[PDB]
Design a protein around this ligand. Structure first.
Ligand SMILES: Nc1nc2c(ncn2[C@@H]2O[C@H](COP(=O)(O)OP(=O)(O)O)[C@@H](O)[C@H]2O)c(=O)[nH]1
Lengths: 192, 427, 184, 96
């Protein structure tokens, strides 16, 4: 599977906002040209989701942190765009590189926390998403009694799977667990 | 039974730590890729202190490298022992500082924290006995000083009992490399005083001065200076790994040297040091070690103890020697210079011996002392800071970060209080 | 072994802040891993054991299969974290007329059958850190009726985060203990 | 004897007093709270011992407890006869 061409690069070359990285202010990693509240959510956010697949700067830095800021500031409006995010999200997971999936899981964890209704709307989309997780589930390494460094890269992909799956299980509701079983045989419920 | 996790911020600090691992691996006989090929069974008595074993007979060191721009990490990977470090051991930011202390601490520090803490975290519950981390950083810069002070607070919060042993390089007062430095050092001192259990001060001016008094290196480079710092670090942590006849650890040295919680800044020194050609003439003995250790031309700190008085002192020895000879020296040099010992804190000098000396240097010693002469150091940076602060042009650089103007004054007030505390304690 | 050593107060058998905390422990791993890591829970030393098949992954002490522990203390205290997964562990004890007796408890267990060669116990925990205490003397006299004799072997299986395994002479409640012989 | 096992790990609550003049025993546990049904059979077992430290403790403990316990000995007779039988059948020169 070649690198399917990312729309975010085509939106960024002419119109995208997050270029601003300049501060004389008490602000975070990225800045916006305009306040995100005025922006629409059908055009910007799906493009941002597609940008996590970028591998070289400045595209991926803006796309990753832009997605985080948009999901944090505007959690009410994202419910409408939830169906449109499945396609670009499914593009990112199929890359299977041990770096993109870390970003995707961070976004997903930041996504389910926004609204229990959102996670209930993601139950039909589990089948479209989980097969990547169902592959990488058991990639941990045995070291015995001595030390793990990987977590400062935050790249121990298995541990990200466990917490993230626990997050959909809590917010998924009544029918999230049975769907997880249909995708993940080795999973066992953490409901209580 | 004593495992230490070593943390390196600083462009300066990362290079120093890499040379330290060069010294340790040569001492232990470790391949720069981690495979044991040494010659002494005593090298594996306590190798777990600094190393991990990966399945495959490879040893990985307890080393954390901290930076904010990938240039230094790229240099470290180009180093000899770059493969020794586990590839995940390195982290680097994505928005540089340019020695701006406020920028690194406030904006870059918060983002860096959630990532950096967790090797400090997962080393702790898996380093087989945590009784102290170790941090090497620079005070004049912005990346090491600001981030190191911030992480020192989080280290104290998450790990209260574990000893936060810190080694810092003081701003050179005649000339140092950076000049945002007086602002940076002032703000870092307030953070360092309260949290760090032990702070050790090193000046590059003294290192160059020592090189030309003793080494007669006509043309030294950074490699020699960091090598001497590595020698001090090897001498400090040698007692934990190797046998001897009388040994003191970090917590013992804190007990033996620190009389009061805020009077714990120490000077460091190493002996013997000799020029590459005149070493044949010299007959290295215990009195030669004692004279070299206490001679002012060998102190690696830009503070003459003769301008002050001594509170507590410590001496360590590497190799096989008679204890009677060592303690014979410790009485007679304690009596010789009674004008430098405080009357109401006797027993300033302490002694220790470790069995295994480093390679080639049959007999070795490391000296750590406490003297009121520290007051000169804070006075110099305060004097330089005063007229710099008197025209607030530079703080607006730090204010735009989010740092309040009043933040500079509380550090200055704490600095003056620390100076006053050392002044009363002289009498 | 441990026979002639002094045994009073507290006597730990696993505690991850030594130098090779498994120096007396033996590990068997299959379809899983023994990994040692830090939890945001306590910021204090822990060991983790996780595996798909719980029976095939365990830790046993002592290391030597033929050799045994001679610990006299009647109380065994475990401080472990429950991972919301299948968990089990077993203990070996000698009795008054010299028959080896073994207890193995499981959370997926069903009943409490006491057939002679091995006793089984069902138990349930609280998600998070637990402080289970097992009074061997009381259990032996309750189940088989024979009095207590020194404890032979201890084994802990996968899917649990263990930070302390120590024996105590009598039952101590909170704060009548060393400050680290409790939960942070 | 088995009585060696309990004394060898500091379980038997007796100690020796070296008041120079006659070797005497001291109690780590006062006789009032002593569980006669448990400790009495052990003292009878120690009579079969050969070396001095166990022999002296066995004699003194057995004679002391028997001569001060009172009616509490009556229930322990069937338990202490068997070790007494084991002691006799040794046909020893001085155990008898
Ligand atoms: N002693 C010594 N100092 C160094 C070396 N390399 C850099 N430095 C010092 O590091 C300081 C600048 O550090 P900076 O770039 O701000 O990075 P920071 O240490 O994280 O603050 C300068 O004062 C240099 O003198 C070295 O190899 N040896």
């Amino acid at each position: 599977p070649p690198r399917e061409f990312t729309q975010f690069r085509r939106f960024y070359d002419r119109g995208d906002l997050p270029i601003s990285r300049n501060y004389g202010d008490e602000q975070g990693p990225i800045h916006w040209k305009v306040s995100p509240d005025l922006l629409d959510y059908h055009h910007y956010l799906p493009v941002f989701f597609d940008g996590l697949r970028e591998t070289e700067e400045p595209y991926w830095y803006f796309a990753y942190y832009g997605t985080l800021d948009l999901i944090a500031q505007g959690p009410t409006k994202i419910l409408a765009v939830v169906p449109q995010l499945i396609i670009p999200l499914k593009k990112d997971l199929n890359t299977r590189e041990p770096e993109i999936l870390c970003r995707c899981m961070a976004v997903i964890q930041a996504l389910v926390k926004a609204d229990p209704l959102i996670s209930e709307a993601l139950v039909p989309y589990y089948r479209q998403i989980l097969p990547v997780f169902n592959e990488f589930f058991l990639d941990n390494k045995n070291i015995g009694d001595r030390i793990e460094y990987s977590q400062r890269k935050h790249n121990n992909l298995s541990d990200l799977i466990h917490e993230t799956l626990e997050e959909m299980e809590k917010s998924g509701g009544p029918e999230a667990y049975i769907n997880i079983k249909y995708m993940i045989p080795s999973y066992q419920s953490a409901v209580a | 039974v004593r495992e230490i996790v070593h943390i390196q911020a600083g462009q300066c600090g990362n290079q120093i730590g890499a040379k330290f691992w060069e010294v340790i691996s040569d001492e232990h006989g470790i391949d720069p890729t981690g495979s044991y090929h040494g010659d002494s069974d005593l090298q594996l008595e306590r190798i777990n202190v600094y190393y991990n074993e990966a399945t495959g007979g490879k040893y990985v060191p307890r080393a954390i490298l901290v930076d904010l721009e990938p240039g230094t990490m790229d240099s470290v990977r180009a180093g000899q022992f770059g493969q020794l470090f586990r590839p995940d051991n390195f982290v680097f930011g994505q928005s540089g500082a340019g020695n701006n202390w406020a920028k690194g601490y406030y904006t870059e520090g918060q983002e860096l924290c959630e990532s950096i803490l967790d090797v400090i975290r997962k080393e702790a519950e898996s380093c087989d006995c945590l009784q102290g981390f170790q941090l090497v950083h620079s005070l004049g810069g912005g990346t090491g000083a600001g981030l190191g002070t911030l992480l020192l607070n989080k280290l104290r919060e998450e790990y209260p009992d574990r000893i936060l042993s810190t080694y810092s390089i003081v701003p050179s007062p005649k000339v140092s490399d950076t000049v945002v430095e007086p602002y940076n050092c002032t703000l870092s001192v307030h953070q360092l005083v309260e949290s760090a259990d032990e702070v050790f001060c090193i000046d590059n001016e003294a290192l160059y001065d020592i090189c030309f008094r003793t080494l007669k290196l006509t043309t030294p480079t950074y490699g020699d200076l960091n090598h001497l710092v590595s020698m001090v670090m090897s001498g400090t942590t040698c007692a934990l790994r190797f046998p001897g006849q009388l040994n003191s650890d970090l917590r013992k040295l804190a007990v033996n040297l620190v009389p009061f919680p805020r009077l714990h800044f120490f000077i460091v020194g190493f002996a013997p040091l000799t020029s590459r050609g005149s070493q044949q003439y010299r007959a290295l003995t215990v009195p030669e070690l004692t004279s070299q250790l206490f001679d002012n031309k060998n102190m690696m700190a830009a503070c003459d103890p003769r301008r002050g008085v001594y509170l507590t002192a410590s001496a360590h020895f590497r190799g096989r020697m008679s204890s009677k000879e060592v303690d014979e020296q410790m009485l007679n040099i304690q009596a010789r210079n009674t004008s430098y010992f405080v009357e109401w804190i006797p027993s300033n000098v302490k002694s220790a011996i470790c069995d295994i000396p480093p390679r080639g240097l049959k007999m070795a010693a490391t000296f750590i002392g406490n003297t009121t002469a520290f007051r000169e150091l804070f006075t110099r940076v305060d004097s330089q800071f005063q007229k710099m602060y008197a025209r607030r042009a530079f703080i607006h650089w730090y204010v735009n970060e989010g740092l309040e103007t009043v933040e500079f004054d509380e550090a200055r007030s704490n600095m003056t209080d620390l100076i006053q505390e050392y002044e009363m304690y002289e009498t | 072994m441990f026979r002639d050593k002094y045994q009073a107060g507290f006597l730990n058998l696993f505690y991850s802040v030594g130098s090779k905390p498994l120096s007396i422990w033996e590990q068997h791993v299959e379809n899983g891993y023994i990994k040692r890591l830090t939890d945001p829970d306590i910021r204090s030393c822990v060991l983790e054991i996780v595996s798909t098949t719980v029976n095939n992954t365990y830790i046993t002490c002592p290391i030597d299969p033929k050799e045994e522990l001679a610990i006299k203390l009647p109380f065994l205290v475990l401080v472990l974290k429950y991972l919301k997964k299948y968990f089990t562990f077993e203990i070996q004890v000698l009795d008054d007329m010299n028959m080896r007796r073994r207890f193995r408890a499981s959370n997926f267990q069903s009943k409490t059958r006491v057939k002679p060669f091995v006793c089984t116990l069902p138990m349930r925990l609280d998600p998070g850190w637990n402080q289970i205490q097992f009074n061997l003397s009381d259990f032996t006299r309750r189940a088989y009726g024979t009095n207590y004799i020194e404890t032979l072997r201890v084994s802990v299986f996968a899917n649990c985060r263990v930070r302390r395994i120590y024996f105590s002479d009598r039952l101590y409640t909170e704060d009548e203990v060393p400050p680290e012989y409790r939960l942070i | 004897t088995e009585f060696r096992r309990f004394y060898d790990r500091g379980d038997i609550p007796v100690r020796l007093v070296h008041t120079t003049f006659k070797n005497a025993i001291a109690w780590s546990v006062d006789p009032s709270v002593l569980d006669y049904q448990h400790y009495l059979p052990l003292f009878f077992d120690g009579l079969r011992e050969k070396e001095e430290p166990y022999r002296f403790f066995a004699r003194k403990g057995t004679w002391e407890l028997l001569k001060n316990g009172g009616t509490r000995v009556l229930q322990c007779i069937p338990q202490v006869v068997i070790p007494l039988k084991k002691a006799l059948d040794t046909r020893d020169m001085d155990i008898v």
